[model samples]
Target: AMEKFAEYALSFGTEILTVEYGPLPIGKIVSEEINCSVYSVDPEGRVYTQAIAQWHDRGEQEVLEYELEDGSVIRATSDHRFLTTDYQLLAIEEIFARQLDLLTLENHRLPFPLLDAGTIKMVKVIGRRSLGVQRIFDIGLPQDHNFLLANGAIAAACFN
Candidate 1:
């Protein structure tokens, strides 16, 4: 079920780079050893951040670790089929602010990264007006609805 969710959620992206899972054999290691490097580039084609993962010699399957810029960690299981993330998983706003080139739509109520066209338009209008007058809104969507916004596209769908 989780695998299906991963696949469906990832389908929005133009590219999906799947990292195969298994134990990585680094052989003998010395002091202060750095094992893996994970990086993400922005839409501007600039290096965002080059992060290193501390490797551990565990089992035979290849395992991969990812460290987000905010110090959160994600671990992938063998077979490249599943992933586990820590409590510090980044929020949508953080990813957008970093421009990591990752756009995610998840299972949530209304007013998520994916929002109804009506809701988004309302928010956009409010936000624009607020910006002009230095005001903020403490509002919420009237009801829950599912939406998809990808590649300069928009759609309304069933709520999760």
Candidate 2:
């Protein structure tokens, strides 16, 4: 089988840490179901979490049915996983996928561009969806980048 990869980048305010591995590393080299718990979403919209999981091909990722606070998770794609709340999908995509050019990061916030590759041509994320929610993410590789893939998955499970 061809190799795939996943990379993770976590941030807390002005501080950021790129996670490359754990009991289950993030990459194509290993395949498992990653179970993560959603702790809370701050007023500023930063989601704090204390859950994680690992899974393989024939595993399941279940979403607990709980009453949403106020916001509604809106659909943006046919698969029903890629989502937005009157917010462009690219905005969140740029943040999670690092799709924007490295220079663009100097400006801090993205200029609200659609989630698509610009200069670098590559396949890194396989976006998946389950239930009415749950956007699952994966990593792809590019030959020019020496076929170097990401270390693991990184996506936000949006909720109200």
Candidate 3:
């Protein structure tokens, strides 16, 4: 799964969600990490959204990606998308702020960074890490001490 057990509900629970990534563009066969979400429609015409979910497969084969640490490469994959709840656009905004950073810094930084060229770069993964780049993505960033200073981009985006 995408995340450890904590505030984000474990994927083993009731809510079920999945990611449907469009076809990859040139040069980018896959992503180092990706987070996605979908809506579940109830019989009452209401849509229930899960704040977090995980994934392990993509098309015919599983996503093959890894992280390197001190000459050792660990093959791994993950998935966790913060569910969009009632007026919880705040969560979405927070994710977008972080995603912009990832796209600008990790995937598309510098003079000639070669990515998918015309593909969607970063995904706004709420409350869950983008796997390798960030430690974990956050849906509703706690208004606590550790994350107080994260208000700049996130708050500005959400409040506005």
Candidate 2 local lDDT, residue 159? 20
lDDT at residue 87 of model 3 (Cα atoms):
17
> TM-score for every candidate vs. truth?
0.19, 0.22, 0.17
Clashing pairs in 1: 22-61, 22-62, 22-63, 23-61, 23-62
Measure candidate 3: CA RMSD: 18.7
lDDT by residue (tens digit), candidate 1, 119-145: 222111000001111111111112221
Provide C-alpha RMSD values for all models, in order.
21.0, 16.6, 18.7
Report model 2's TM-score to 2 decimal places: 0.22
lDDT of 2 by residue, 8-92 (tens): 1111111111223322222222143334332222234332333333222212233222111222121122221222232222322
Query: Candidates' lDDT values, in order?
Result: 0.22, 0.24, 0.23
How many clashes (backbone N, Cα, C below 3 Å) per candidate? Answer: 5, 19, 9
TM-score of 1: 0.19
Error of 2 at 7 (Å): 23
lDDT per residue (tens digit) for residues 90-133 in model 3: 23324334442222101732222223222312323333232332
Of models 1 and 3, which has the larger TM-score?
A: 1
Using TM-score as the measure, what is the rank order of every candidate, best first? Answer: 2, 1, 3
lDDT of 2 at 2: 25
